[PDB]
Amino acid sequence: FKEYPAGEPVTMNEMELAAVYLQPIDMEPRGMGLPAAKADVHLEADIHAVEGNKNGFGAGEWIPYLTISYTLVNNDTGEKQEGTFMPIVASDGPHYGANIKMMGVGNYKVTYHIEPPSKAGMHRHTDSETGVGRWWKPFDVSYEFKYVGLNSSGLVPR
């Protein structure tokens, strides 16, 4: 299952945030996201702390409890799609993502709208000895990538 980068990684709020896509992936449970057979790609957000993180995460650690929605735009046509990622585990670890129905060939921009763990129920110590400070404000990161589809082998045509 071949992975393709979407744009360039960005470092923001002491996290590294990358976007990747691959062929649609069957997931359990069912009912929240689009089924694989009804999608064109599986789109992911890879998000991990970097050194100096002030919210309690060590370098390289996954950031859990994020709420992440996406705005996908095919800039060739102007077509826009809104959706929301789920937290997902795979053999190479936890991430966020969704199966997506794409909008044809084009130069795309995808924006990930990211809310901090407080919005999904994660609390924080506030004592002087073990406390951490307030969360960063919800923020956006965007990726620009050229999309032509994936073929029956799950590969980008050459």
Residues that bind a copy of itself (CB under 8 A): 1, 25-29, 32-33, 55-58, 61-62, 64-65, 86-94, 117-118, 121-127, 129-132, 134
Q: Is residue 24 a contact residue for Cu ion (CB under 5 A)?
A: no
Q: Tell me the closest approach of the beta carbon of residue 113 to a copy of itself, in angstroms.
A: 18
Q: Is residue 12 a contact residue for Cu ion (CB under 5 A)?
A: no
Q: Tell me the closest approach of the beta carbon of residue 87 to a copy of itself, in angstroms.
A: 4
Q: Tell me the closest approach of the beta carbon of residue 104 to a copy of itself, in angstroms.
A: 25
Q: Count CB atoms within 10 A of the CB of residue 56.
A: 16
Tokens of residue 23, six digits: 């062929």
Contact 38, 60 (CB under 8 A): no
The footprint of Cu ion on this chain (CB under 5 A) covers a number of residues equal to 5
| Cα dist from 121 to 15, 21, 34, 85, whole Å | 20, 28, 25, 17
Q: Tell me the closest approach of the beta carbon of residue 106 to Cu ion, in angstroms.
A: 22
Which one of residues 65, 86, 140, 148 is an interface residue with Cu ion (CB under 5 A)? 140
Q: Which of 57, 39, 40, 56 is nearest to 48 (CA)?
A: 57
Taking CA 32 as the corner, what is the angle to CA 30 and CA 36, rounded to the nearest 5 degrees? 60
> Which C-beta is closer to a copy of itself: that of 34 or that of 144?
34
- In sequence order, which residues have a C-beta less than 8 Å from that of residue 127 and are 6 or more positions away? none
Contact 144, 107 (CB under 8 A): yes
Question: From a copy of itself, Cu ion, none, which one binds at residue 131 (CB under 5 to 8 Å depending on kind)?
Answer: a copy of itself
Q: Tell me the closest approach of the beta carbon of residue 131 to a copy of itself, in angstroms.
A: 7
Tokens of residue 75, six digits: 């800039």
- In the complex, the residues that contact Cu ion under the rule CB under 5 A are 44, 88, 97, 113, 140
